[model samples]
Target: DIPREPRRIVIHRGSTGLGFNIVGGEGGEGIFISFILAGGPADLSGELRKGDQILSVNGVDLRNASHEQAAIALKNAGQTVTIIAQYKPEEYSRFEA
Candidate 1:
């Protein structure tokens, strides 16, 4: 598959939150989107997906961020959050298959 460009997603935070879970980023691994809750802010945006690697949030780099740090960044990203992420559906396709 050809390399895909990273997506810049802008989400308006819901009352609950961004409505997605993040994983990885430990030991230098890239931070990836784990789940997108239906009807949540991320889900409503329709730009984010599971397995997408997050590069940054609100211009804060997450390329080398730890899990906890990344979590905090997301939490503190304010009402409107802008996310830079690389689409990586293939990485998680095997599990679905």
Candidate 2:
């Protein structure tokens, strides 16, 4: 069976507080986003959301990536970054039906 495509968002961030990650779970893992600062790059892009689950950066898998690693990835993005994501509700509702 073909796998579903993950929601993706391409954006640019810098010293600006682009987003954040909620840490902790069964194994203390974490995810990032939510700060589409008003009129900022992320906000201007209109491609981000408050609860988007980041799946990757530039095609790299972040499913098991730590907060620190994610931070480094963001830092290394330099200018543009392709973010593959899934809206939080969409990911959790897979079992609702």
Candidate 3:
């Protein structure tokens, strides 16, 4: 439903956290990245973008899960976590330069 691009994130033992928040709803209310911590794992990684919609966490499909459910998957990702995400370009508008 938006610009689709796959993303991967790896968290080592010293990693602080993913540093983002997610909100869940229905089809039109897909999961979204609410925020990211400055200079944190997610911010430094650069693999994820603001407002990116997650397709799945690790190998678990998030297409039909609640926000809490997805959060659990992230917690269980162990030392390595992979995230497949897509940035929805249509959600924002462009301004003339």
Candidate 4:
């Protein structure tokens, strides 16, 4: 099951104006991140980004967050302590002449 606390990110998977390729290496944690939309605090603060990773919840590493854990976190992540995150990236490349 997917984690609820992690929040669900929506990828506007469309061809952007500038088509760039991701070579053998991925975009890394900073630039490459899954979308996450939390409730209350996060939505109010508007600090989270579609490309940002949620590394920790209440000082707990997200890598260890279970599905239920993530859901709970998402619901209250921003209410109290900020949920930290790391980027989960992928590899790709662009074709140029």
Highest-scoring model, TM-score? 1
Residue by residue across 1-97, what tens digits does model 4's lDDT show? Answer: 2232454322221223111111111223222223333443333444444434455556556554444555554445342454553323222112111
Best by lDDT: 1
Name the regions of candidate 1 deviating beyond 4 angstroms.
1-3, 92-97
Task: Report lDDT (Cα) of residue 78, candidate 4.
Answer: 44
Sort the candidates on lDDT, descending order.
Answer: 1, 3, 2, 4
TM-score, cand. 3 = 0.75
Candidate 4 regions off by >4 Å? 1-40, 43-46, 76-78, 87-97
How many pairs of residues collide in each model?
0, 0, 0, 17
lDDT tens digits by residue: candidate 1, 1-97: 3248987889988877899998877764678888899999888877888888899998899989898999999999999999999987766454333
Compute each candidate's TM-score over C-alphas. 0.86, 0.68, 0.75, 0.38
Candidate 3, clashing residue pairs?
A: none
Q: Quick one: RMSD of model 3?
A: 5.2
Error at 43, model 3, angstroms: 0.5
Candidate 1, poorest ten consecutive residues by summed lDDT: 88-97
lDDT tens per residue, model 2, 1-97: 1124566667766566454433322243346463456766666767666556678888677778876777777677667788786666444333222
